[PDB]
């Protein structure tokens with residue numbers, strides 16, 4: 001019953017979703033810039049990227065400041081099979097991959113990522129209420145700027161048996177869940 005405000009801005013595809021519009025302010029800037037700012041109640045996920053996504057190298061920079069449940073990550077979806085994937089570059093409080101079965105590890109882009117897999121039952125997705133899997137690559141050394149070899153993560157996932165379907169959208173997402181925080185992030189290739 002909540003569908004995301006999608007579109008184009010600065011030569012990039014953008015997606016911004018929230019169940020509490022008054023708790024969060026999402027703003028598109030020139031180029032690949034976007035700024036999100038939130039506090040209090042609500043679930044907010046916003047960002048800029050590509051549609052569809054692929055095995056590309058995603059450069060990004062800017063400031064990211066969390067206070068509670070929040071993450072800065074390369075975030076996207078695939079179909080057949082339906083899969084939500086994360087390349088968590090940064091996060092606050094709470095490790096978003098908590099409760100995720102660890103499938104392995106991978107060393108890429110100046111750090112080591114832990115690989116997890118979890119399952120969401122009867123949860124909101126790009127195809128509405130469905131049961132789907134989530135792939136996780138969590139960066140041990142958090143950062144707010146750098147580059148992400150998504151293809152490398154996809155390969156490392158494919159090794160441990162976490163295969164993907166045909167890609168939907170692929171954005172640099174800032175997320176906040178019943179917390180406060182703010183980020184000004186510019187994306188690039």
Ligand SMILES: CO[C@@H]1OC[C@@H](O)[C@H](O)[C@H]1O
Pocket residue numbers: 002003004017045124125126
């Ligand atoms: C948090 O998951 C959200 O759930 C609904 C989908 O429409 C959005 O794309 C996705 O971000």
